[PDB]
């Protein structure tokens, strides 16, 4: 019920992300991040994506970011059928898998969604696809 893009961008988001990564509190991280998630524009997010994913790279993986991200993907998905986002995220996805590590499915599940979302924004990029 506030904020404009700079006010968010610079001056709120900066603050959040440090706080998140050193706070470590998984219970907190999951809820709160969700509050961010819940509350704010995927466009805003869109403009901050890169930061986002780099935050994603740095967690106690008892946080289930996969869902969070997924929820995001979904959020994007509905918009999407309505940027090399995929690439960005992609580079990150591997990285991520590395930056945490994955029981193999989670990743796949993300992949399915990656498909569903990526399709919807981008109804191809075979380069993705493959």
């Amino acid at each position: 019920q506030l904020v404009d893009l700079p006010t968010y961008r610079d001056s709120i988001l900066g603050p959040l992300l440090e706080q998140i990564v050193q706070c470590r509190d998984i219970l907190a991280q999951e809820y709160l991040l969700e509050v961010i998630t819940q509350v704010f524009p995927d466009e805003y997010h869109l403009h901050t994506l890169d930061q986002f994913l780099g935050a994603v790279s740095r967690l106690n993986p008892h946080v289930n970011v996969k869902a969070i991200v997924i929820g995001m993907m979904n959020r994007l998905s509905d918009y999407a059928e309505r940027v090399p986002l995929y690439d960005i995220f992609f580079d990150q996805v591997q990285h991520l898998v590395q930056a945490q590590h994955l029981p193999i499915q989670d990743t796949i599940a993300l992949c399915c969604s990656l498909a569903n979302l990526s399709l919807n924004i981008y109804p191809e990029r075979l380069d993705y696809v493959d």
Side-chain angles (χ1 to χ4, degrees), residues 16-118:
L16 326 179
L17 304 184
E18 93 304 317
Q19 242 263 254
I20 288 160
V21 294
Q22 42 60 356
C23 65
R24 311 280 60 196
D25 195 296
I26 288 99
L27 197 166
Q29 280 163 329
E30 295 155 320
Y31 171 63
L32 294 167
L33 278 169
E34 150 287 304
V35 207
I36 316 175
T37 306
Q38 262 293 351
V39 176
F40 296 111
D42 300 50
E43 54 75 23
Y44 275 0
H45 311 334
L46 189 147
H47 310 326
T48 56
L49 281 164
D50 49 287
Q51 303 124 48
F52 121 62
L53 315 126
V56 169
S57 313
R58 304 179 294 239
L59 286 170
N60 328 255
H62 336 297
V63 183
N64 188 249
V65 210
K66 176 212 52 47
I68 303 184
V69 158
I70 276 167
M72 152 54 106
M73 295 158 96
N74 313 138
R75 287 157 67 272
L76 295 166
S77 296
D78 12 277
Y79 186 57
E81 264 299 297
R82 227 105 68 185
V83 217
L85 295 164
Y86 168 100
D87 118 75
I88 291 161
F89 306 158
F90 222 53
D91 324 306
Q92 265 266 333
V93 159
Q94 298 78 240
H95 112 68
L96 192 52
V97 176
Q98 317 139 16
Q100 304 311 325
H101 285 106
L102 306 176
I104 304 118
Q105 193 267 19
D106 298 72
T107 331
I108 318 177
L110 289 154
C111 294
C112 326
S113 47
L114 255 142
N116 311 331
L117 176 55
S118 78

